[PDB]
Design an enzyme around this catalytic site. Sequence first.
Site, PDB file in Angstrom:
ATOM      1  N   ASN A  36       0.842  -1.139   0.000  1.00 26.40           N
ATOM      2  CA  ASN A  36       0.000   0.000   0.000  1.00 26.40           C
ATOM      3  C   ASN A  36       0.900   1.217   0.000  1.00 26.40           C
ATOM      4  O   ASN A  36       1.835   1.262   0.788  1.00 26.40           O
ATOM      5  CB  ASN A  36      -0.911  -0.085   1.207  1.00 26.40           C
ATOM      6  CG  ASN A  36      -2.045   0.880   1.142  1.00 26.40           C
ATOM      7  OD1 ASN A  36      -2.640   1.180   2.169  1.00 26.40           O
ATOM      8  ND2 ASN A  36      -2.355   1.405  -0.055  1.00 26.40           N
ATOM      9  N   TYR A  65      -8.513  12.849  -1.608  1.00 28.86           N
ATOM     10  CA  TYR A  65      -8.480  11.969  -0.440  1.00 28.86           C
ATOM     11  C   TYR A  65      -8.264  12.782   0.843  1.00 28.86           C
ATOM     12  O   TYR A  65      -7.659  13.880   0.815  1.00 28.86           O
ATOM     13  CB  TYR A  65      -7.378  10.926  -0.585  1.00 28.86           C
ATOM     14  CG  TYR A  65      -7.039  10.114   0.667  1.00 28.86           C
ATOM     15  CD1 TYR A  65      -6.039  10.510   1.537  1.00 28.86           C
ATOM     16  CD2 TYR A  65      -7.678   8.920   0.930  1.00 28.86           C
ATOM     17  CE1 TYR A  65      -5.711   9.755   2.639  1.00 28.86           C
ATOM     18  CE2 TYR A  65      -7.373   8.159   2.016  1.00 28.86           C
ATOM     19  CZ  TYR A  65      -6.383   8.567   2.868  1.00 28.86           C
ATOM     20  OH  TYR A  65      -6.074   7.795   3.975  1.00 28.86           O
ATOM     21  N   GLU A  79     -12.581   8.472   6.592  1.00 28.11           N
ATOM     22  CA  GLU A  79     -11.629   8.431   5.495  1.00 28.11           C
ATOM     23  C   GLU A  79     -12.428   8.510   4.185  1.00 28.11           C
ATOM     24  O   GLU A  79     -13.362   7.760   3.990  1.00 28.11           O
ATOM     25  CB  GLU A  79     -10.804   7.154   5.547  1.00 28.11           C
ATOM     26  CG  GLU A  79      -9.625   7.172   4.601  1.00 28.11           C
ATOM     27  CD  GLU A  79      -8.861   5.868   4.540  1.00 28.11           C
ATOM     28  OE1 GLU A  79      -9.456   4.781   4.717  1.00 28.11           O
ATOM     29  OE2 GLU A  79      -7.649   5.920   4.302  1.00 28.11           O
ATOM     30  N   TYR A  88     -12.837   9.320  -0.224  1.00 28.39           N
ATOM     31  CA  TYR A  88     -12.205   9.256  -1.532  1.00 28.39           C
ATOM     32  C   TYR A  88     -13.124   9.798  -2.593  1.00 28.39           C
ATOM     33  O   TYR A  88     -14.282   9.396  -2.692  1.00 28.39           O
ATOM     34  CB  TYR A  88     -11.968   7.825  -1.933  1.00 28.39           C
ATOM     35  CG  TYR A  88     -10.895   7.055  -1.221  1.00 28.39           C
ATOM     36  CD1 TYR A  88     -11.174   6.376  -0.022  1.00 28.39           C
ATOM     37  CD2 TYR A  88      -9.631   6.904  -1.801  1.00 28.39           C
ATOM     38  CE1 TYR A  88     -10.216   5.628   0.610  1.00 28.39           C
ATOM     39  CE2 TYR A  88      -8.666   6.141  -1.183  1.00 28.39           C
ATOM     40  CZ  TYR A  88      -8.967   5.506   0.014  1.00 28.39           C
ATOM     41  OH  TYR A  88      -7.994   4.753   0.607  1.00 28.39           O
ATOM     42  N   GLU A 148      -2.853   6.576  -4.925  1.00 22.70           N
ATOM     43  CA  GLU A 148      -2.758   5.451  -4.011  1.00 22.70           C
ATOM     44  C   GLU A 148      -2.527   4.159  -4.796  1.00 22.70           C
ATOM     45  O   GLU A 148      -3.123   3.953  -5.848  1.00 22.70           O
ATOM     46  CB  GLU A 148      -4.005   5.328  -3.148  1.00 22.70           C
ATOM     47  CG  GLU A 148      -4.061   4.004  -2.414  1.00 22.70           C
ATOM     48  CD  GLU A 148      -5.000   3.996  -1.210  1.00 22.70           C
ATOM     49  OE1 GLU A 148      -6.055   4.699  -1.173  1.00 22.70           O
ATOM     50  OE2 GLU A 148      -4.674   3.214  -0.288  1.00 22.70           O
TER      51      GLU A 148
END
Length: 206
Positions: A45, A85, A94, A96, A184
């Site tokens: 990641n 983000y 969180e 996106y 990402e």
Amino acid sequence: TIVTDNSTGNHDGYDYEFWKDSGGSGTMILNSGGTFSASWNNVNNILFRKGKKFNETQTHQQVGNMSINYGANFQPNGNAYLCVYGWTVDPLVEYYIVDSWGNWRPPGATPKGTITVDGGTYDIYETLRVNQPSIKGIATFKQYWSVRRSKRTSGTISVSNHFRAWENLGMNMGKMYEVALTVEGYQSSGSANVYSNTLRINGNPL
């Protein structure tokens, strides 16, 4: 200047962050204002981002109207997103806003609705993350997603429009912790050149 390891700074007035876990490699090169380029190879990641970090005291409405004008040469080999983000605190969220992706359209859940905005259609999604790494340690928190129906790698993202739409479907937002233009990567390699990236607050550049 070159970043190849977890690093959190400020460059040309934009808050930047390079974050990766163990395995593979990554290179973020910091360029003018909001721009940057990224190379990653065999990672679990990785996140490369450049935007604004906030002091954690105001809601999005208080902060003002946010909008991002960007352009990117996005070349993922595998699973990767190109997106706005960030996070809210209280509740921990969180989120996106995804404009393009590699071979898999995220986040693989059931759409809760659509917003149409900035010339396209986005499916909206809410997911749950249970005892996961977060900005506030291991926590249980939600993810909000707006995912475009077809891929785009330049244009405007009217960030606040998304937020309004999330709150409208009863996905409540906490206090701003971050909004950033993000690349990402998940279990992939690839490169992204973010040749253009201007965050505006109330028509006000950074």
